[PDB]
Design an enzyme around this catalytic site. Structure first.
Site, mmCIF file in Angstrom:
data_model
loop_
_atom_site.group_PDB
_atom_site.id
_atom_site.type_symbol
_atom_site.label_atom_id
_atom_site.label_comp_id
_atom_site.label_asym_id
_atom_site.label_seq_id
_atom_site.Cartn_x
_atom_site.Cartn_y
_atom_site.Cartn_z
ATOM 1 N N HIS B 43 0.809 -1.212 0.000
ATOM 2 C CA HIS B 43 0.000 0.000 0.000
ATOM 3 C C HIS B 43 0.846 1.268 0.000
ATOM 4 O O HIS B 43 0.301 2.364 0.172
ATOM 5 C CB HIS B 43 -0.973 0.010 1.187
ATOM 6 C CG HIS B 43 -0.309 0.073 2.526
ATOM 7 N ND1 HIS B 43 0.401 -0.983 3.058
ATOM 8 C CD2 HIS B 43 -0.259 1.063 3.449
ATOM 9 C CE1 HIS B 43 0.863 -0.643 4.249
ATOM 10 N NE2 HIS B 43 0.478 0.592 4.509
ATOM 11 N N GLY B 144 2.856 5.211 10.106
ATOM 12 C CA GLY B 144 4.204 5.104 9.596
ATOM 13 C C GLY B 144 4.978 3.898 10.079
ATOM 14 O O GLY B 144 6.120 3.702 9.645
ATOM 15 N N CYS B 146 4.158 0.830 9.430
ATOM 16 C CA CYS B 146 4.047 -0.249 8.456
ATOM 17 C C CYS B 146 5.397 -0.521 7.806
ATOM 18 O O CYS B 146 6.136 0.402 7.453
ATOM 19 C CB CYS B 146 3.008 0.097 7.391
ATOM 20 S SG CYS B 146 1.298 0.106 7.988
HETATM 21 C C1 LIG Z 1 0.950 1.874 8.147
HETATM 22 O O1 LIG Z 1 0.806 2.440 6.857
HETATM 23 C C2 LIG Z 1 -0.327 2.068 8.942
HETATM 24 C C3 LIG Z 1 -0.134 1.625 10.391
HETATM 25 C C4 LIG Z 1 -1.340 1.926 11.278
HETATM 26 C C5 LIG Z 1 -1.672 3.390 11.520
HETATM 27 C C6 LIG Z 1 -2.490 3.350 12.800
HETATM 28 N N1 LIG Z 1 -1.920 2.201 13.495
HETATM 29 C C7 LIG Z 1 -1.239 1.387 12.693
HETATM 30 O O2 LIG Z 1 -0.636 0.358 13.042
HETATM 31 N N2 LIG Z 1 -1.423 1.320 8.323
HETATM 32 C C8 LIG Z 1 -2.506 1.881 7.774
HETATM 33 O O3 LIG Z 1 -2.694 3.095 7.741
HETATM 34 C C9 LIG Z 1 -3.533 0.918 7.174
HETATM 35 C C10 LIG Z 1 -3.713 1.177 5.679
HETATM 36 C C11 LIG Z 1 -4.473 0.093 4.917
HETATM 37 C C12 LIG Z 1 -3.793 -1.258 5.081
HETATM 38 C C13 LIG Z 1 -4.594 0.449 3.443
HETATM 39 N N3 LIG Z 1 -4.809 0.945 7.872
HETATM 40 C C14 LIG Z 1 -4.854 0.688 9.191
HETATM 41 O O4 LIG Z 1 -3.883 0.514 9.891
HETATM 42 O O5 LIG Z 1 -6.121 0.610 9.624
HETATM 43 C C15 LIG Z 1 -7.168 0.988 8.692
HETATM 44 C C16 LIG Z 1 -8.426 0.669 9.452
HETATM 45 C C17 LIG Z 1 -8.477 -0.842 9.620
HETATM 46 C C18 LIG Z 1 -8.378 1.360 10.806
HETATM 47 S S1 LIG Z 1 -9.973 1.205 8.572
HETATM 48 C C19 LIG Z 1 -11.305 1.144 9.732
HETATM 49 C C20 LIG Z 1 -12.215 2.195 9.787
HETATM 50 C C21 LIG Z 1 -13.267 2.163 10.686
HETATM 51 C C22 LIG Z 1 -13.443 1.095 11.542
HETATM 52 C C23 LIG Z 1 -12.541 0.070 11.473
HETATM 53 F F1 LIG Z 1 -12.692 -0.995 12.305
HETATM 54 C C24 LIG Z 1 -11.486 0.063 10.588
#
Ligand SMILES: *[C@@H](O)[C@H](C[C@@H]1CCNC1=O)NC(=O)[C@H](CC(C)C)NC(=O)OCC(C)(C)Sc1cccc(F)c1
Ligand SMILES: *[C@@H](O)[C@H](C[C@@H]1CCNC1=O)NC(=O)[C@H](CC(C)C)NC(=O)OCC(C)(C)Sc1cccc(F)c1
Lengths: 302, 302
Positions: B43, B144, B146
């Site tokens: 991503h 960040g 990830c």
């Molecule tokens: C690294 O890019 C980042 C790491 C996270 C930021 C917050 N804590 C982390 O460990 N990952 C992301 O931003 C992900 C991007 C996706 C894989 C394209 N998303 C992520 O970590 O979570 C997205 C959700 C699962 C929070 S979306 C969501 C919205 C509403 C309710 C719910 F349960 C999930």
């Protein structure tokens, strides 16, 4: 719901490069190699039959420069030896090329430092501990782990604050700062020693309560407040440390909107009992997380 | 009395040398540099407006070799790019001179692996987690993080088993193995996803009960025994994982002299309630310590 708080240790790569093996006869342990100086516990000179009550002054005179064998897994020749407190200051002809920017500091009760557990000069594991009010730590140490170092990091600078020396009857551990002084009233002798009482760290319980509010858990928060002076008087009769506010605690109060005195009142009532409820999946107050840990791990504020 | 058991992580020095920063436009994250291959979450190619439902196949075609910027804090030129599952396989013209002996493995529920938290390609902290039955972990990750890697060590060989991808609503975290598959039924899309139930790890609770016996706490041990087959039937109706004995558990049984079936019966009664007593300073069963952790930290058996 997970709090997002874990026992987090600093990266150990910088310290692993400074770990060496020190042998002074029949005993081997770990040493810290910074510049042309190798620090190690002074009971490496002790024969096994005198650990209970050793005369380190006489033993040090009995040693020569060729009495200390320093090895990195490279063998280091000793060009000088000296003793400061409960630590040995061995001088070597080669400076550690991977010496990091470092200082020597003393860690206080309630503060957290990272430990690099080593055996025979080889790093084996890392963990973080909080210095308890009785100047012990709840670590994981075994035979040969002496010389393992405890450190804090402020930027690229590593502040060394702990060298493992002994394990107590209660299973806890204590060591010495790099000025030679053992933490608390402890002595590096293989005898039973009186251990001071352990206390709940108030500033860390307050931080842990703030972390729950940052995770949506605020059932314990009531409008009632208890002043720091009144809480400290209460703390003296209930095995709690006296609370001293810090800027880090103030940041948590500002972000949450909950005053410290509100949580001090909560701790007093939570000490009497959680009453079947849970905070962050626990029924007891936790003092193993510092305000800086909650600031860093949950809000990314260092 | 302290148990001598702490959340112990492997030394991270070998892995820190393999951490790089990967940027594919407006998004930056961490990558793993082994030989001439840089692994990173896929991503990184996703623009911020399509994280909820991205078409990675179309995005990958939209990328070129000069679309990925790899930096070590040295800048790495990308000579090839490919996608396997939820991971990107970027080829670079320079092999990591500090590449350790390594394998790629999949970690199973109840097993523990060490995590190196990184931001902008710079290691920030390390911690150990246990893969939960719902294929999530209770970690400490922020924006960040990830690209942070999870690994186990068997000797000098590092078995990489986890790359952080996302955080769930419950505050837990999940990622992908280095074959491209996300753990569990999770997908690398910014949407709410159904999370399976979490369960107590029976083999880890048994280990934790054995550790108490190794520390003198054996009030829960009664001559009554419960067979594995009967316990597993009971576990299916009480949110407990089915127990599978291992050689490590057998070592703990041999040393303590307490049978596994004795502790399985104890867990059934301890699940109903500790009845005001405590085990290792806790009123609940702990499944965050593996049998190998108790074997290593308390008895020095690896
Ligand atoms: C690294 O890019 C980042 C790491 C996270 C930021 C917050 N804590 C982390 O460990 N990952 C992301 O931003 C992900 C991007 C996706 C894989 C394209 N998303 C992520 O970590 O979570 C997205 C959700 C699962 C929070 S979306 C969501 C919205 C509403 C309710 C719910 F349960 C999930
Ligand atoms: C490193 O040399 C080694 C590390 C310990 C081995 C067991 N766990 C450890 O962390 N340290 C020692 O062997 C110490 C040597 C002294 C400093 C000369 N001793 C030690 O760790 O403990 C000695 C005591 C305190 C256990 S002696 C004792 C005996 C009976 C009752 C009691 F409370 C204390």
């Amino acid at each position: 719901h997970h709090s997002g708080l874990v026992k987090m240790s600093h990266p150990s790569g910088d310290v692993e490069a400074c770990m060496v093996q020190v042998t002074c006869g029949s005993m081997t342990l770990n040493g810290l190699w910074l510049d042309n100086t190798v620090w190690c516990p002074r009971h490496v000179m002790c024969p096994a039959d005198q650990l209970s009550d050793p005369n380190y002054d006489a033993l040090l005179i009995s040693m020569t420069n060729h009495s200390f064998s320093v090895q990195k897994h490279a063998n280091l020749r000793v060009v000088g030896h000296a003793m400061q407190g409960t630590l040995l200051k061995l001088t070597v002809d080669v400076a550690n090329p991977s010496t990091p920017a470092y200082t020597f500091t003393t860690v206080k009760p309630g503060a957290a430092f990272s430990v690099l557990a080593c055996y025979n000069g080889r790093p084996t594991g890392t963990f973080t501990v909080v210095m308890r009010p009785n100047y012990t730590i709840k670590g994981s140490f075994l035979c040969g782990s002496c010389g393992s170092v405890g450190y804090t990091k402020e930027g690229s600078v590593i502040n060394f604050c702990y060298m493992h020396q002994m394990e107590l009857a209660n299973g806890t551990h204590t060591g010495s700062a790099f000025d030679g002084t053992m933490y608390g009233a402890f002595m590096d002798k293989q005898v039973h020693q009186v251990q001071l009482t352990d206390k709940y760290c108030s500033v860390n319980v307050v931080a842990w309560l703030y972390a729950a509010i940052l995770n949506g858990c605020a059932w314990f928060v009531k409008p009632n407040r208890t002043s720091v002076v009144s809480f400290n008087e209460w703390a003296l009769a209930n095995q709690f440390t006296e609370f001293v506010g810090t800027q880090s605690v103030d940041m948590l109060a500002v972000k949450t909107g909950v005053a410290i005195e509100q949580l001090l009142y909560a701790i007093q009532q939570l000490y009497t009992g959680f009453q079947g409820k849970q905070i962050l999946g626990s029924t007891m107050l936790e003092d193993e997380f510092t305000p800086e840990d909650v600031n860093m791990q949950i809000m990314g504020v260092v």
